[PDB]
């Protein structure tokens, strides 16, 4: 997260960190006791044994509850940057309570409204290209950018109906490498998307691009 601030305990009861080969890798969201939502590109085709999830902590390295993966299901139409969502099943069930809870999902068919505020969180880099990553969770609030404006930035065919965009025109606030898969929520703390891709991090006139929960709810509902 670039331009962010520290998350507080209980800000995102459902957020999980996803480590790979013992290092930072991605974020995700706990949907229920044995299911995590993340970006497909975080997991597709990689050895599943390399991943560990941690829930219930602001830290990616300590605290909370951990689990390995039992299975991975990528959206059947995942291709390039499109339809960048996956469902992870956990070997260890994670009960709600305390600072752990399950995400509330955006309604099927919903699309975030341009100009509305959204909050993204993660353990990713704090600068484009940064090698260090914070131990504790960061968050940033950014407005939703219309799909038309986002297409002006990236190209008409690059931004599909299963993506939405968010960021500030002058840059400075964004998700970045290592934030992929983690949550973007609306102002009510409803899960509207997962961090997916963008052109660098926090650059002027290049919005962050997010996989849309609203658009992809049919897939989520099938396998959750």
UniProtKB/Swiss-Prot annotation:
Active site: 41, 84, 180
Superkingdom of the source species: Eukaryota
Entry's Gene Ontology molecular function annotations: serine-type endopeptidase activity
GO annotations of cellular component type: extracellular region
GO biological process assignments: proteolysis
Disulfide bond entries: 26-42, 150-165, 176-201
CDD domains linked to this entry: Tryp_SPc (cd00190)
Primary location class: secreted
Residue ranges of every copy of the Peptidase S1 domain listed in the record: 1-224
Keywords: Disulfide bond, Hydrolase, Protease, Secreted, Serine protease, Signal, Zymogen
Family indicated by similarity: Belongs to the peptidase S1 family.
Protein name: Trypsin
Species of origin: Fusarium oxysporum
């Amino acid at each position: 997260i670039v331009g962010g601030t520290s998350a507080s305990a209980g800000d995102f009861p459902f957020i999980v960190s996803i480590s790979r080969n013992g290092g930072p890798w991605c974020g995700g969201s706990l949907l229920n006791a044995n299911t995590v939502l993340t970006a497909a590109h975080c997991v597709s085709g990689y050895a599943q044994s390399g991943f560990q999830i941690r829930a219930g902590s602001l830290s990616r390295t300590s605290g909370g509850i951990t689990s390995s993966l039992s299975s991975v299901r990528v959206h059947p139409s995942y291709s390039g940057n499109n339809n960048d969502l996956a469902i992870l099943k956990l070997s260890t069930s994670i009960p709600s309570g305390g600072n752990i809870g399950y995400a509330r999902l955006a309604a099927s068919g919903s699309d975030p409204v341009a100009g509305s505020s959204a909050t993204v969180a993660g353990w990713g880099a704090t600068s484009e290209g940064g090698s260090s990553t914070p131990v504790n969770l960061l968050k940033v609030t950014v407005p939703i950018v219309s799909r038309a404006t986002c297409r002006a930035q990236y190209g008409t065919s690059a931004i599909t109906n299963q993506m939405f965009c968010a960021g500030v025109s002058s840059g400075g606030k964004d998700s970045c490498q290592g934030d992929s898969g983690g949550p973007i929520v609306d102002s009510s703390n409803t899960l509207i998307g997962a961090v997916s891709w963008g052109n660098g991090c926090a650059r002027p006139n290049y919005s962050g691009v997010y996989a849309s929960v609203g658009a992809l709810r049919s897939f989520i509902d099938t396998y959750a």
